[PDB]
Amino acid sequence: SSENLTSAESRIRDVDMASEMMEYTKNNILTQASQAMLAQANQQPQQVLQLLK
Amino acid sequence: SSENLTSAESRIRDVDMASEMMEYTKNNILTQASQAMLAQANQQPQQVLQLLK
Amino acid sequence: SSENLTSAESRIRDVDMASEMMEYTKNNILTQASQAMLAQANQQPQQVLQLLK
Amino acid sequence: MRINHNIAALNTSRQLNAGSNAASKNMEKLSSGLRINRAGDDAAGLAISEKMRSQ
Amino acid sequence: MRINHNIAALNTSRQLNAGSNAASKNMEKLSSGLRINRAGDDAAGLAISEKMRSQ
Amino acid sequence: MRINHNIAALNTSRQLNAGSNAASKNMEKLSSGLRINRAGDDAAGLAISEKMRSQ
Amino acid sequence: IRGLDMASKNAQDGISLIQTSEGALNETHSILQRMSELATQAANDTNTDSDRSELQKEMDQLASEVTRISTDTEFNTKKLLDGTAQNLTFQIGANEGQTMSLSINKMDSESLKVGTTYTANDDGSKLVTADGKEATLVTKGPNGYYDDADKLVYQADSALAKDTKVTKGIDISSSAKAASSALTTIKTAIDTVSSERAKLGAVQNRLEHTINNLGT
Amino acid sequence: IRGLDMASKNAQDGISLIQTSEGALNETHSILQRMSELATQAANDTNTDSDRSELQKEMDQLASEVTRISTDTEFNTKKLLDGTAQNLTFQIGANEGQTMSLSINKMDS
């Protein structure tokens, strides 16, 4: 009854290493995609200076 | 009648060590094959960052 | 009465080699999992430099 | 290239948690030495065995 | 071209502080090895677990 | 993105210095062969053992 | 999607609830198996009543352990084998009516008929079983809770506390004929335990297929 | 152009609807495969009726899962394997009549 409950509690509490590392990598890329586009988002307002002169 | 029934019950209940160790090794490899390809599966989405810049 | 008490004291005091080696290996992996993720945790703040320039 | 979901890795995860389960089931038999540990391995095998052991 | 506000960059900032939070939450699970660290990850999971551990 | 503090790494450090401690405690038992090395592992176990050894 | 991945947790939390029950009945089989050797030995007539009643000591101790497993086996805070875990509905599916029921029968010595459980009345004068078989205290001879036929039921000189249950094994010590009679009763109990175990092994096999299909 | 690029979404939303159905029948195969071992074992005459009826417990539980897959397999809000997904028309093309039909039969026990 300890094995059957230890296994029962592990499924509820312990994390799946495979299903979590794969999900961590996804959000670790989605933040770099937003990081990359944030840099370009700041460059866009810089083009009105050539028009203002 | 005990030998004839002990042998009869062993065939029904006891496991074949040879036929089971050989099967255990197979699934013990199929999980490493999936383990190896899971690592590469996470690397594939990482290549869009070089395109996003 | 010495055997019955020696066995009684061993259960209270002596460790189970199997149940302890298996537990030692678990924490010996959980520390490497935290070791592996600590390295990546330090890399994450390094990405703001490409945005700051 | 869709980033929010990695179906290639999500599919590989299921196959990962399907050979591990089979290996765990195989190691139960190897350690105990019995084909039928739970009643789900053989219902009639479990029933016949207990009659046999009793006899 | 409106200069006093960069809605394109302001919108990207929120998505930046929404995948970083998710990655931080994912790394908590990976380091600890537990799905339920806080009680907000699973209320019933937290309740069942503690009963289970106690047992 | 806050730089002056890395809560993700600071949280991982605590889990790093919590499995190392457990592994160290487990290796004490494995080397000595005794469950109860210190009195904090089992107070009643320590008390009963010494009575037992004496006897 | 967030329903099927959560209904896959329910399917696996039902696999654990079912493994616990059949894991418990795994031992009711061994106790019933040992309990059957102490009726082929008690049926031999080289034994005397001093030795049949000697075997009855383990008879009552095995039958009292079969009852313990039923009332003690507990997943979460649910008693599985005491007959209260009925109509257990697992939501294996993301919608209404995508459930599976389950009913585990009472699997104690009283239900298998390999024993009987007396409970102590409020004063403790008479041990009372369900269906109401009396066992009065200090009734003189050796001291204990005697029955209406002078057959000692429990060996105690004081009075038992309130709602203290005692389990008494099936009769194998009164005669060799009685011990033989208990042989079919025990071997039938092994049959109604094997039926329960594979009623739970069948559900677990189904839930293993439900998990692969929910994951796919 | 805006039709072919949208009709390419319909073609891929039909690929998903079809992968779901055959993904479900992937398991009706395994249940039917296990269901066939519990008839070569039940046909042996060393079994007794106490044990054939013992196998029937899993017989009825496997056959009740084959029915579940049919009535539960659902893409979008469409039951695919219950015999109601008939004449499914995918507009693979930017014009009239550039469609493909499909009819999945009822696949329950």
XYZ file of C-alpha atoms in Angstrom:
649
model
C 0.000 0.000 0.000
C 2.973 2.356 0.211
C 4.112 1.602 -3.338
C 0.583 1.982 -4.663
C 0.241 5.297 -2.848
C 3.769 6.508 -3.572
C 3.116 5.966 -7.269
C -0.305 7.574 -6.874
C 1.188 10.648 -5.214
C 4.031 10.932 -7.721
C 1.581 11.222 -10.617
C -0.290 13.995 -8.809
C 2.739 15.879 -7.494
C 5.907 15.081 -9.449
C 6.514 16.765 -12.793
C 7.122 15.015 -16.100
C 10.684 15.940 -17.017
C 10.179 15.368 -20.742
C 6.864 17.207 -21.053
C 8.227 20.118 -18.990
C 11.662 20.591 -20.545
C 9.983 20.684 -23.952
C 7.556 23.319 -22.677
C 10.323 25.344 -21.030
C 12.219 25.525 -24.318
C 9.119 26.817 -26.104
C 8.622 29.802 -23.800
C 12.387 30.274 -23.802
C 12.102 30.856 -27.559
C 8.904 32.914 -27.517
C 10.698 35.396 -25.259
C 13.625 35.654 -27.678
C 11.208 36.181 -30.564
C 9.639 39.035 -28.610
C 13.125 40.235 -27.678
C 14.150 40.304 -31.337
C 11.048 42.199 -32.449
C 11.251 44.676 -29.565
C 14.599 45.874 -30.915
C 13.060 46.531 -34.331
C 9.980 48.129 -32.762
C 12.208 50.856 -31.316
C 13.930 51.473 -34.659
C 10.679 52.281 -36.469
C 10.055 55.694 -34.793
C 13.645 56.690 -35.637
C 12.779 57.177 -39.327
C 10.791 60.402 -38.893
C 13.995 62.369 -38.250
C 15.045 62.073 -41.898
C 11.627 63.486 -42.818
C 11.722 66.307 -40.256
C 14.884 67.808 -41.774
C -0.480 -34.966 -8.328
C 1.403 -32.123 -6.654
C 4.250 -32.222 -9.174
C 1.817 -32.377 -12.074
C -0.097 -29.426 -10.648
C 2.967 -27.481 -9.517
C 4.319 -27.702 -13.054
C 0.872 -26.840 -14.399
C 0.641 -23.752 -12.197
C 4.194 -22.634 -12.960
C 3.451 -22.484 -16.689
C 0.370 -20.354 -16.030
C 1.874 -18.090 -13.372
C 5.679 -18.028 -13.503
C 7.426 -15.879 -16.093
C 9.931 -17.078 -18.672
C 13.180 -15.384 -17.694
C 14.678 -15.601 -21.181
C 11.608 -14.411 -23.086
C 11.109 -11.555 -20.601
C 14.660 -10.250 -20.242
C 14.862 -10.084 -24.032
C 11.600 -8.134 -24.115
C 12.690 -5.821 -21.297
C 15.841 -4.894 -23.209
C 13.786 -4.022 -26.290
C 11.582 -1.480 -24.519
C 14.663 -0.295 -22.647
C 16.103 0.658 -26.046
C 12.912 2.042 -27.585
C 12.782 4.540 -24.718
C 16.369 5.640 -25.363
C 15.597 6.026 -29.065
C 12.681 8.275 -28.130
C 14.912 10.006 -25.582
C 17.530 10.701 -28.248
C 15.013 12.079 -30.742
C 13.235 14.193 -28.123
C 16.451 16.164 -27.625
C 16.648 16.908 -31.350
C 12.924 17.688 -31.506
C 13.496 20.604 -29.127
C 16.428 21.929 -31.171
C 14.367 22.302 -34.350
C 12.262 25.310 -33.184
C 15.482 27.071 -32.129
C 16.420 27.811 -35.758
C 13.802 30.520 -36.349
C 15.759 32.977 -34.188
C 18.475 33.320 -36.834
C 15.707 34.146 -39.321
C 13.916 36.612 -37.032
C 16.987 38.862 -36.770
C 17.684 -13.832 23.555
C 20.750 -12.221 21.995
C 19.770 -13.235 18.464
C 16.208 -12.063 19.004
C 17.484 -8.747 20.341
C 20.322 -8.382 17.840
C 17.800 -8.780 15.034
C 15.438 -6.428 16.858
C 18.132 -3.769 17.190
C 19.313 -4.159 13.598
C 15.848 -3.329 12.264
C 15.728 -0.192 14.408
C 19.307 0.954 13.832
C 20.829 -0.560 10.686
C 19.979 0.921 7.300
C 18.480 -0.938 4.358
C 21.192 -0.861 1.709
C 18.776 -1.321 -1.190
C 16.191 1.228 -0.055
C 18.947 3.759 0.708
C 21.143 3.424 -2.375
C 18.030 3.880 -4.504
C 17.147 7.008 -2.533
C 20.701 8.354 -2.709
C 20.671 8.077 -6.500
C 17.416 10.037 -6.675
C 18.744 13.069 -4.804
C 22.002 12.664 -6.708
C 19.979 13.275 -9.881
C 17.713 16.013 -8.524
C 20.846 18.028 -7.753
C 22.137 17.596 -11.307
C 18.751 18.647 -12.678
C 18.975 21.796 -10.564
C 22.612 22.168 -11.613
C 21.642 21.982 -15.283
C 18.841 24.531 -14.950
C 20.952 26.911 -12.858
C 23.320 27.302 -15.810
C 20.430 28.276 -18.082
C 18.945 30.546 -15.411
C 22.081 32.698 -15.581
C 21.962 32.885 -19.387
C 18.472 34.408 -19.451
C 19.461 37.881 -18.111
C 22.247 38.022 -20.719
C 19.753 38.675 -23.538
C 18.931 42.273 -22.577
C 22.332 43.456 -23.829
C 21.317 42.908 -27.458
C 18.255 45.062 -26.747
C 20.180 47.799 -24.922
C 22.365 48.527 -27.962
C 7.438 27.352 -38.670
C 4.997 27.374 -35.762
C 6.659 28.037 -32.418
C 3.872 28.011 -29.815
C 3.498 24.233 -30.188
C 6.117 21.578 -30.948
C 4.030 18.677 -32.225
C 7.197 16.773 -33.120
C 8.359 16.901 -29.499
C 4.853 16.447 -28.101
C 4.435 13.278 -30.169
C 7.842 11.986 -29.067
C 6.883 12.546 -25.427
C 3.969 10.117 -25.708
C 6.215 7.436 -27.189
C 8.639 8.208 -24.366
C 5.890 7.575 -21.813
C 4.905 4.355 -23.565
C 8.158 2.376 -23.603
C 8.971 3.439 -20.073
C 5.638 1.988 -18.960
C 6.332 -1.227 -20.864
C 9.820 -1.478 -19.365
C 8.387 -0.920 -15.885
C 5.843 -3.681 -16.473
C 8.580 -5.977 -17.766
C 10.763 -5.310 -14.731
C 7.911 -6.176 -12.368
C 7.790 -9.643 -13.912
C 11.567 -10.018 -13.886
C 11.922 -9.044 -10.227
C 8.987 -11.087 -8.919
C 9.400 -13.991 -11.321
C 5.648 -14.105 -11.996
C 3.762 -13.398 -15.209
C 0.606 -12.424 -13.329
C 1.279 -9.854 -10.618
C -1.907 -7.826 -11.030
C -5.206 -9.320 -12.117
C -5.056 -7.296 -15.338
C -2.230 -9.385 -16.768
C -4.456 -12.479 -16.932
C -7.938 -12.636 -15.424
C -8.399 -16.329 -16.174
C -4.732 -16.878 -15.376
C -5.254 -15.328 -11.956
C -8.408 -17.373 -11.372
C -6.871 -20.689 -12.459
C -3.680 -20.056 -10.501
C -5.414 -19.490 -7.168
C -7.495 -22.637 -7.594
C -4.261 -24.421 -8.471
C -2.289 -23.061 -5.502
C -5.153 -23.911 -3.153
C -5.147 -27.452 -4.507
C 3.643 58.736 -37.467
C 3.023 59.325 -33.768
C 6.219 59.618 -31.744
C 5.148 60.238 -28.138
C 3.917 56.639 -27.837
C 5.247 53.457 -29.449
C 2.287 51.094 -29.210
C 4.156 48.518 -31.292
C 6.961 48.404 -28.726
C 4.601 48.761 -25.766
C 2.610 45.755 -26.988
C 5.792 43.735 -27.524
C 6.895 44.520 -23.966
C 3.821 42.809 -22.521
C 4.471 39.682 -24.575
C 8.073 39.905 -23.385
C 6.891 39.924 -19.768
C 4.567 36.998 -20.435
C 6.920 34.337 -21.805
C 9.567 35.211 -19.259
C 7.018 34.556 -16.514
C 6.041 31.256 -18.125
C 9.689 30.234 -18.477
C 10.312 31.122 -14.831
C 7.335 29.003 -13.789
C 8.567 26.141 -15.963
C 12.050 26.317 -14.460
C 10.643 26.131 -10.932
C 9.106 22.771 -11.806
C 12.244 21.555 -13.563
C 14.548 22.448 -10.671
C 12.320 21.127 -7.882
C 10.916 18.189 -9.824
C 7.385 18.919 -8.587
C 4.329 20.013 -10.549
C 2.779 21.685 -7.509
C 5.189 24.054 -5.782
C 2.680 26.746 -4.840
C -0.940 26.027 -4.017
C -2.023 27.946 -7.121
C -0.743 25.263 -9.483
C -3.305 22.750 -8.188
C -5.533 23.392 -5.181
C -7.008 19.893 -5.176
C -3.614 18.536 -6.187
C -2.059 20.186 -3.148
C -4.833 18.909 -0.880
C -4.710 15.324 -2.176
C -0.915 15.234 -2.091
C -0.618 16.197 1.574
C -3.198 13.598 2.576
C -1.240 11.125 0.464
C 2.166 12.024 1.929
C 0.744 11.857 5.450
C -0.605 8.397 4.687
C 13.314 42.299 -17.642
C 14.777 43.035 -14.216
C 18.542 42.597 -14.070
C 19.583 43.466 -10.506
C 17.997 40.247 -9.211
C 17.678 36.837 -10.871
C 14.848 35.216 -8.929
C 14.866 32.270 -11.333
C 18.499 31.529 -10.480
C 18.076 32.434 -6.811
C 15.198 29.958 -6.528
C 17.208 27.259 -8.307
C 20.085 27.789 -5.872
C 17.896 26.837 -2.909
C 16.794 23.633 -4.625
C 20.467 23.030 -5.391
C 21.304 23.339 -1.692
C 18.440 21.020 -0.776
C 19.208 17.883 -2.793
C 22.888 18.140 -1.997
C 22.003 18.102 1.700
C 19.723 15.106 1.186
C 22.412 13.272 -0.784
C 24.951 14.014 1.952
C 22.559 12.640 4.565
C 21.939 9.559 2.429
C 25.661 8.940 1.997
C 26.222 9.101 5.756
C 23.832 6.178 6.158
C 25.345 4.265 3.250
C 28.916 4.620 4.508
C 28.194 3.861 8.169
C 25.458 1.313 7.533
C 23.257 2.842 10.245
C 19.911 4.597 9.918
C 20.468 6.596 13.101
C 23.831 8.358 13.125
C 22.722 11.559 14.844
C 19.953 11.694 17.416
C 17.850 13.793 15.036
C 17.210 10.876 12.695
C 15.218 9.025 15.369
C 14.989 10.177 18.982
C 13.068 7.110 20.129
C 15.146 5.005 17.754
C 18.309 6.271 19.418
C 16.873 5.675 22.889
C 15.620 2.152 22.142
C 18.836 1.194 20.365
C 21.125 2.083 23.267
C 18.954 0.150 25.710
C 19.050 -2.718 23.224
C 22.829 -2.616 22.711
C 23.378 -2.434 26.467
C 21.183 -5.496 26.887
C -7.434 19.985 -25.288
C -7.217 21.194 -21.701
C -10.045 18.769 -20.959
C -8.480 15.670 -22.482
C -5.148 16.367 -20.816
C -6.967 16.789 -17.506
C -9.280 13.841 -18.139
C -6.057 11.910 -18.676
C -5.127 12.766 -15.095
C -8.504 11.513 -13.886
C -7.998 8.283 -15.810
C -4.619 7.879 -14.140
C -5.956 8.838 -10.721
C -8.455 6.028 -11.220
C -5.710 3.635 -12.224
C -4.055 4.395 -8.890
C -7.313 3.971 -6.979
C -7.788 0.585 -8.627
C -4.209 -0.616 -8.180
C -4.588 0.071 -4.465
C -7.702 -2.099 -4.202
C -6.358 -5.089 -6.107
C -3.033 -4.646 -4.353
C -4.934 -5.097 -1.099
C -6.882 -8.135 -2.357
C -3.535 -9.580 -3.365
C -3.092 -10.328 0.327
C -6.602 -11.477 1.059
C -5.678 -14.195 -1.390
C -2.635 -15.233 0.603
C -4.470 -15.172 3.865
C -7.305 -17.213 2.378
C -4.695 -19.561 0.929
C -3.046 -20.119 4.305
C -6.494 -20.267 5.880
C -7.203 -23.281 3.667
C -4.205 -25.256 4.915
C -5.558 -24.834 8.429
C -8.606 -26.808 7.408
C -6.968 -29.765 5.680
C -4.805 -30.161 8.765
C -7.746 -29.687 11.128
C -9.818 -32.256 9.222
C -7.362 -35.065 9.951
C -8.453 -37.156 12.924
C -4.993 -37.615 14.387
C -5.532 -34.121 15.777
C -7.210 -33.772 19.147
C -9.559 -31.012 20.225
C -6.633 -29.552 22.157
C -4.930 -29.170 18.759
C -7.914 -28.279 16.598
C -8.611 -25.447 19.028
C -4.887 -24.815 18.767
C -5.269 -24.265 15.023
C -8.353 -22.145 15.679
C -6.064 -19.559 17.261
C -4.547 -18.817 13.857
C -7.958 -19.268 12.235
C -9.303 -16.345 14.251
C -6.135 -14.330 13.688
C -6.160 -14.786 9.919
C -9.878 -14.046 9.693
C -9.305 -10.914 11.773
C -6.658 -9.749 9.299
C -8.931 -10.237 6.292
C -11.332 -7.858 8.019
C -8.535 -5.383 8.734
C -7.580 -5.126 5.062
C -11.174 -4.314 4.143
C -11.624 -1.585 6.748
C -8.079 -0.190 6.504
C -7.441 -0.103 2.752
C -7.944 3.561 1.971
C -7.091 5.598 -1.102
C -7.271 9.352 -0.491
C -9.875 9.262 2.316
C -12.069 6.589 0.731
C -12.484 3.105 2.162
C -12.395 0.945 -0.949
C -13.042 -2.610 0.226
C -15.647 -1.951 2.935
C -18.573 -1.814 0.516
C -18.926 1.976 0.531
C -16.962 2.609 -2.690
C -19.884 2.196 -5.069
C -20.774 4.113 -8.233
C -17.283 5.590 -8.421
C -17.498 7.828 -11.478
C -14.273 8.662 -13.309
C -14.608 11.535 -15.761
C -12.588 9.979 -18.566
C -13.426 12.601 -21.157
C -13.761 16.336 -21.552
C -17.574 16.488 -21.699
C -20.714 15.346 -19.908
C -21.454 11.659 -19.635
C -17.939 10.648 -20.659
C -17.603 8.713 -17.432
C -17.022 5.185 -16.202
C -18.636 3.702 -13.124
C -17.151 1.186 -10.712
C -18.388 -0.691 -7.657
C -16.111 -2.683 -5.369
C -18.001 -5.079 -3.131
C -17.395 -5.558 0.573
C -14.475 -7.975 0.885
C -14.176 -8.641 4.610
C -14.376 -11.962 6.421
C -18.056 -11.463 7.212
C -18.911 -11.002 3.534
C -16.747 -13.897 2.344
C -18.279 -15.985 5.176
C -14.849 -16.990 6.486
C -15.434 -15.265 9.818
C -17.790 -13.238 11.951
C -17.357 -9.887 13.679
C -18.793 -9.307 17.139
C -19.002 -5.764 18.458
C -19.082 -4.845 22.126
C -22.268 -3.347 23.508
C -22.190 -0.047 25.375
C -21.677 -1.606 28.818
C -19.487 -4.416 27.454
C -21.587 -7.149 29.021
C -22.398 -8.943 25.759
C -20.519 -9.005 22.471
C -23.020 -8.373 19.680
C -22.584 -9.253 16.036
C -24.626 -8.013 13.121
C -27.764 -10.180 12.829
C -27.484 -10.149 16.640
C -25.693 -13.174 18.080
C -25.081 -12.626 21.778
C -21.926 -13.369 23.741
C -22.255 -12.582 27.442
C -19.339 -11.970 29.793
C -18.126 -14.244 32.644
C -20.553 -17.043 31.815
C -18.248 -20.303 35.553
C -15.428 -22.185 33.849
C -12.638 -20.388 32.003
C -13.320 -16.673 31.873
C -14.471 -14.904 28.720
C -17.422 -13.895 26.552
C -19.449 -17.072 26.366
C -22.113 -17.856 23.784
C -25.542 -19.525 24.120
C -23.885 -22.946 23.809
C -21.076 -22.544 26.392
C -18.651 -22.287 23.455
C -16.174 -19.596 24.457
C -16.152 -16.780 21.904
C -13.574 -14.352 23.307
C -10.951 -14.906 25.994
C -11.039 -11.913 28.324
C -11.497 -11.503 32.062
C -12.202 -7.760 32.135
C -14.924 -6.098 30.061
C -14.146 -4.921 26.548
C -14.439 -1.220 25.794
C -17.291 0.365 23.838
C -17.538 -0.462 20.118
C -14.540 -2.793 20.171
C -14.869 -5.320 17.366
C -13.561 -8.868 17.591
C -13.367 -11.207 14.612
C -13.759 -14.953 15.064
C -12.760 -17.356 12.320
C -14.957 -20.008 10.786
C -15.388 -23.075 12.972
C -12.719 -25.718 12.378
C -12.112 -26.834 15.967
C -15.455 -28.362 16.957
C -14.952 -31.554 14.931
C -13.306 -33.054 11.884
C -16.612 -32.793 10.021
C -16.763 -29.067 10.768
C -13.212 -28.548 9.519
C -14.077 -30.322 6.269
C -17.190 -28.160 5.954
C -15.042 -25.042 6.281
C -12.952 -26.281 3.351
C -15.629 -25.503 0.758
C -16.458 -22.222 2.479
C -12.826 -21.146 2.275
C -12.298 -22.364 -1.283
C -15.440 -20.508 -2.341
C -14.159 -17.325 -0.710
C -11.046 -17.634 -2.863
C -13.418 -17.772 -5.831
C -15.303 -14.593 -4.911
C -12.003 -12.812 -4.321
C -10.631 -13.848 -7.707
C -13.863 -12.528 -9.213
C -13.360 -9.163 -7.526
C -9.691 -8.934 -8.468
C -10.345 -9.329 -12.185
C -13.403 -7.115 -12.044
C -10.784 -4.530 -11.062
C -8.111 -5.780 -13.434
C -10.579 -5.470 -16.281
C -11.258 -1.824 -15.454
C -7.545 -1.101 -15.157
C -6.871 -2.643 -18.566
C -9.625 -0.476 -20.032
C -8.232 2.638 -18.364
C -4.838 1.910 -19.904
C -6.441 1.977 -23.352
C -8.403 5.103 -22.446
C -5.159 6.885 -21.577
C -3.444 6.139 -24.889
C -6.535 7.280 -26.766
C -6.859 10.443 -24.683
C -3.171 11.159 -25.206
C -3.433 10.593 -28.946
C -4.931 33.882 -54.661
C -6.785 34.669 -51.448
C -8.971 31.668 -52.248
C -6.197 29.139 -52.791
C -4.372 30.270 -49.666
C -7.622 29.926 -47.726
C -8.579 26.681 -49.455
C -5.163 25.496 -48.302
C -6.333 26.080 -44.736
C -9.479 24.055 -45.404
C -7.367 21.242 -46.827
C -5.252 21.308 -43.681
C -8.273 21.569 -41.399
C -9.484 18.405 -43.107
C -6.135 16.734 -42.601
C -6.552 17.396 -38.884
C -10.131 16.117 -38.881
C -8.948 12.925 -40.561
C -5.882 12.403 -38.375
C -8.180 12.550 -35.356
C -10.429 9.798 -36.712
C -7.677 7.380 -37.694
C -5.844 8.250 -34.499
C -8.934 7.048 -32.652
C -9.257 3.862 -34.737
C -5.618 3.231 -33.926
C -6.884 2.145 -30.520
C -9.930 0.252 -31.666
C -7.328 -1.917 -33.327
C -5.510 -2.573 -30.077
C -8.667 -3.265 -28.187
C -9.851 -5.626 -30.913
C -6.408 -7.227 -30.858
C -6.547 -7.854 -27.115
C -10.186 -8.862 -27.496
C -9.004 -11.667 -29.780
C -6.644 -13.154 -27.201
C -9.600 -13.431 -24.849
C -11.209 -15.825 -27.278
C -8.307 -18.176 -27.960
C -7.910 -18.509 -24.207
C -11.650 -18.907 -23.650
C -11.869 -21.582 -26.353
C -9.516 -23.924 -24.499
C -11.411 -26.531 -22.495
C -9.113 -26.477 -19.489
C -11.050 -23.349 -18.540
C -14.193 -23.743 -16.478
C -17.330 -21.645 -16.717
C -16.152 -19.885 -13.565
C -13.142 -18.770 -15.637
C -14.797 -18.227 -19.003
C -17.224 -15.900 -17.243
C -14.109 -14.525 -15.585
C -12.721 -13.614 -19.007
C -16.123 -12.232 -19.986
C -15.567 -9.458 -17.451
C -12.792 -8.030 -19.620
C -14.762 -8.941 -22.744
C -17.550 -6.601 -21.667
C -15.074 -3.953 -20.543
C -13.143 -3.948 -23.812
C -16.329 -3.927 -25.879
C -17.585 -1.016 -23.778
C -14.413 0.932 -24.571
C -14.737 0.375 -28.317
C -18.150 2.013 -28.026
C -16.715 4.882 -25.984
C -14.173 5.761 -28.670
C -16.929 5.960 -31.272
C -19.212 8.215 -29.237
C -16.432 10.294 -27.650
C -14.076 10.955 -30.567
C -14.957 14.517 -31.476
C -13.201 17.036 -33.687
C -14.513 20.581 -33.229
C -18.058 19.647 -32.121
C -18.510 16.806 -34.613
C -18.764 13.162 -33.605
C -16.667 11.452 -36.257
C -16.971 7.724 -35.589
C -20.642 7.530 -34.561
C -21.947 7.382 -38.126
C -23.119 11.001 -38.271
C -20.036 12.388 -40.056
C -21.231 11.701 -43.586
C -20.868 13.775 -46.756
C -18.179 15.917 -45.151
C -17.374 18.421 -47.885
C -13.958 20.083 -47.833
C -13.696 23.109 -50.103
C -10.265 22.327 -51.514
C -10.301 25.026 -54.159
C -11.246 28.643 -54.650
C -14.414 28.065 -56.699
C -17.671 26.124 -56.745
C -17.580 22.357 -56.903
C -13.892 22.184 -56.018
C -14.747 19.978 -53.072
C -14.052 16.510 -51.736
C -16.579 14.379 -49.903
C -15.934 11.932 -47.083
C -18.042 9.495 -45.081
C -16.792 7.726 -41.968
C -18.927 4.755 -41.003
C -20.125 3.962 -37.503
C -17.267 2.144 -35.771
C -18.689 1.105 -32.409
C -18.984 -2.385 -30.964
